[PDB]
């Protein structure tokens, strides 16, 4: 009929500033169009379309986009990929992300799921048509999803299959929880245990719904690279690593929580298998708006901090979206 599932280069839009010092401003300066001040969304009357968060190429577009952003800004002084080294100019540039709309070129339209309790896979019955998505800060991190968009209705548990154990669990929060990360004038990061623990017992309520009233137990990450055992994230150009053993406390104790981070300059790359080293009053205040978890006897289930596939960080924002191409007929 009208429109079909399509794969086309998506252009980007930005409310950026060309003169800015923040470096994302130089990947949006002359790569993203000014954000349209009079957009249009159109309701598609008596129409149901089926979305699939886990299999859409807007995710892939965005990942290679952010890999490019990350390469040109903050090129590391020495990649290794063990088998051929590359030392290069590693100038110190400013850094912290800013939102970027993705947009169809003419002849295509973004279909938007408007069911607030859509989980990620299957039928949506309140479908809309848009030119550009909402703003999406390109931030890469593990275990916790920062500066993201909140679930507008009830807390959601996004997954491919909850019967499969491999597939990640994205919990999408209802209301955000802040997190201060400072390197005191070798670092730490504090959070208000009160609201955070309330929000968390909420998440185990919703989990209980999906795992019929069973016993929900958080546990630290098993093992492996430091970037999956720890809340690792690039904060204003410097890479933090905060031990999140505390936040997932199975005996919560409801006063301000402190976490011990390490700033590292030699890290494991996410662009592709390898390791990077970057040149050498810094603090990040951040809305925590989602969690990544992997489902691990008794009637107890064990949930452990996940992350690592940075695609999931994009899935969390782009589940409500499907590119389609308008067919003109009559």
């Amino acid at each position, epitope marked *: 009929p*009208v429109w079909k599932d399509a794969d086309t280069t998506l252009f980007c839009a930005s409310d950026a500033k060309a003169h800015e010092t923040e470096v994302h401003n130089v990947w949006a300066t002359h790569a993203c169009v000014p954000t349209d001040p009079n957009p249009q969304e159109i309701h598609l*009357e008596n129409v149901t379309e089926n979305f699939n968060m886990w299999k859409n190429n807007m995710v892939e577009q965005m990942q290679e986009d952010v890999i490019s952003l990350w390469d040109q800004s903050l090129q590391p002084c020495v990649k290794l990929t063990g088998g051929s080294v590359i030392k290069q100019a590693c100038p110190k540039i400013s850094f912290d992300p800013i939102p970027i709309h993705y947009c169809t070129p*003419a002849g295509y*339209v973004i279909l938007k799921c408007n069911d607030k309790n859509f989980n990620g896979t299957g039928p949506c019955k309140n479908v809309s*048509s848009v*030119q550009c998505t909402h703003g999406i800060k390109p931030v890469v991190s593990t275990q916790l999803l920062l500066n993201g968009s909140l679930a507008e209705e009830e807390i959601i548990i996004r997954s491919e299959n909850l019967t499969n154990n491999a597939k990640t669990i994205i919990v999408h929060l209802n209301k955000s929880v802040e997190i201060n990360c400072t390197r005191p004038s070798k670092a730490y990061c504090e959070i208000n245990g009160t609201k955070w623990n309330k929000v968390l017992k909420q998440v185990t309520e919703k989990l209980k719904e999906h795992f019929n009233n069973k016993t929900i137990i958080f546990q630290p990450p098993s093992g492996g690279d430091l970037e999956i055992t720890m809340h690792s994230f690039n904060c204003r150009g410097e890479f933090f690593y905060c031990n999140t053993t505390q936040l997932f406390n199975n005996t919560c104790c409801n006063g301000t929580i402190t976490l011990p981070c390490k700033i590292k300059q030699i890290i494991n790359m996410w662009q592709g298998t390898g390791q990077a080293m970057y040149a050498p009053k810094i603090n990040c205040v951040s809305n925590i708006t989602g969690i990544l978890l992997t489902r691990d006897n008794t009637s107890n289930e064990t949930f452990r901090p996940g992350g690592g596939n940075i695609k999931d960080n994009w899935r969390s924002e782009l589940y409500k979206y499907k590119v389609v191409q308008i067919e003109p*007929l*009559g």
Partner: antibody
Amino acid sequence: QVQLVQSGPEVKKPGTSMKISCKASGFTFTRSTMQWVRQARGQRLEWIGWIVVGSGNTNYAQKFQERVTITRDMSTSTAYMELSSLRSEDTAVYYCAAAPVGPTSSDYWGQGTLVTVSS
Amino acid sequence: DIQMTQSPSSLSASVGDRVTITCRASQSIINYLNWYQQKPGRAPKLLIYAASSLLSGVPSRFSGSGSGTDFTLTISSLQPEDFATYYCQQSYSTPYTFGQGTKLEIKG
């Protein structure tokens, strides 16, 4: 025979209003957002507004925001434009046109309607 | 607000020629641009959608291309019923504005 037939010419006084019809045949009216245009003699074509048929959603240019009303009727498959407190520089040929959906697209055309506004 | 312009205002070519005709956008549309033909007394016809997409039933003579600001519509094998005024339009934003207009005359 894919086409759209509009109503006759109109001669109004400054301060009144006009209504113009547009009867569709040939495409599935069901999935189009009818678009309206005007051409002042030997000047530029101007986009006025649209009505998505299915939803009934509309939108207009900041220019005609407060005087224009776009409407339709799925029974007859017909669109309508109403233009309020007319002025002399609203004299022109008004066209309806068909179009896919989204925010704007491509468009099929009707015959045009000459309307003249003077004292 | 986006202001679209055309060049040239009028162009003269003869039968069987090839013509270029060029539209220009201020705030860079991406490829949200249509090309319409118009003969006096009659209503426009759609030649090109997107900026390269040709409508089914348009003679494959006409052809289009563009970037973000600068677009072009060539004819190539100019026939006698291609002596009209040609209009570029932007989709994308605000009031979807049309071009100044370009007329083709017989360069006989």
